[model samples]
Target: GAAWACFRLDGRTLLRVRGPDAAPFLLGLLTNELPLPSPAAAGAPPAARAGYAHFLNVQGRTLYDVILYGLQEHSEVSGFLLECDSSVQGALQKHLALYRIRRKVTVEPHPELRVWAVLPSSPEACGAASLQERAGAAAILIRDPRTARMGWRLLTQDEGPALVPGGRLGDLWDYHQHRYLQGVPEGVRDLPPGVALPLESNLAFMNGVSFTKGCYIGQELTARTHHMGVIRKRLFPVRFLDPLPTSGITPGATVLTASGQTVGKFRAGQGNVGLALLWSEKIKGPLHIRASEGAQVALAASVPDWWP
Candidate 1:
């Protein structure tokens, strides 16, 4: 499957932000730096226009997971665009506004655009041939900041340009399945708000957390987890032997170890494959969970080889 697979991201929306202070305003709040400074300033290589981040409440709990897009290199006025959960567009806008008492920034929903996830078959981070035209275009593309295996995102105002040449059209579940297989959680449902930690959700492994950056709202917990604590549980891909009835093993169903101690919750899935936040100690060991149909479903859970 070394071909391009396109998924219409209907569950997502674009939050358009612009103003003189957008970058700095966002930098002070999010878990990672906004605009990320100049690459050369940090003695690093250049990056694409977009990077992934989390919008956390003051408690450091995941609120809205988003893909943030900035103008390439150095530019002004076009501002920034955020791809996030469409259902919470109003909340996200209000949250940004609350942080903007004195700063110059305005947040609104983009009136004429859609977000799409474009996954390439092979391992390609930047410079995918399918995305060659995106280098300097308004319609942008970025390697999924979460993982290389997660592929890229394409945003277009064209209603029907969702398809890519030589690429097959696929359902959003295909994208979800792929993400789960890589042990990457998408949307707040997988990394539930008021609960999940960035580290346990593999944010650092995905380059979505920054320890060297200045103060963000929830920096204390993120930093403490990275430096002091051992992360015992994490999001990992899991599978059942077969597709059982929907009545059994619904999301939030607790996973159990061989000794029957509760480990974690089942979040999202398709068929037999899904993402689960489970104890890291039992990932490679036998795991089981109670089915809604009053049966025990044994699941094989493990982090993919790509994880560090």
Candidate 2:
């Protein structure tokens, strides 16, 4: 694989949470606030958009990550459209049920729609009218609040795109590279259950965290880590001078220094660029990658503000 991998899942699942309590219920779970700029605010002049958000456990590890589309208040629906991994539909439904204690809100997975992405400037040229007709006529240019990559995702009817698939996974890879260069942490293998905190993974800097929003399931630990600086291990980008060893690289493997002290562990690296969990303390200089067969790799330090 190249430095990036991108592809659409088979089918898109839209979780529609509608009711008077929709705002409050989502505020408690997601990292960002739900009741902000109206969804109908989209127009020809360009508008600010929502960003990546995640639900975390009590320990502040991500459970489900999603991008929220705010909807305007209407007689039929006054809620948000949440996109997530379709594989966890059942589990997410159960999770939402836990908080639906007489809120007058209904959470149902909308299997009637499919999601398609137009990375950067590709949408105008590649997006077809037939695909728009099959999907939906309405399109929104969403600014990826993390990387600010101006990605346009279409929410269409269940039938699927009518246009020929012109874009390849390589287009998606460029978007991922843009994300990594901007210090955005995605839900990849390096970012898994109980492995990362929202702040330690640069969520806060990416506009993925809401400080003023009252309380959520894992707010306590997340707030503590942010205010107290409890994050000792941080996720940063690295480059493998040679080919990747394999996907089975351990989390705490010794990343050797000249003095033989283990400084960090390989997290997930692909296409030469990787995400690593490393010590917060400064190393003397660049660190060397030590492998079983004396293979050599080199790593460069990165900071949260690198993209800015």
The TM-score leader among the candidates is 1
In the range 1-308, model 2's lDDT, one tens digit per residue, is 12212334443366877777887888888887763453443342222235567778777787766777765433223467787766666777888898787687888886665655545334334333222211112433344455534344556552212332333343446555554554455553556655666676767756778888898978888877788865677777765555556653455556766666778776654466667777868444667677666646666656644334
Candidate with best lDDT: 1
Q: Which RMSD does model 2 reach against the true structure? A: 5.8
Residue-level lDDT tens digits of model 1 in 178-267: 877777788767877767777887888877778888888788888887888778878889888645665655878888877878887787
Report, for every candidate in turn, its global Cα lDDT versus the true structure: 0.74, 0.60
Error of 1 at 253 (Å): 1.0
Q: Which stretches of candidate 2 lie over 4 Å from their true place?
A: 1-13, 39-49, 73-77, 121-138, 150-152, 157-171, 230-232, 246-254, 304-308
**Candidate 1 residue pairs that clash:** 248-292, 249-292
Off by over 4 Å in 1: 36-48, 72-77, 122-130, 133-138, 159-163, 292-295
Clashing pairs in 2: 3-271, 135-156, 135-157
- Residue 246 error, candidate 2, Å: 5.5
Query: Total clashing residue pairs per candidate?
Result: 2, 3
Error of 1 at 236 (Å): 0.8
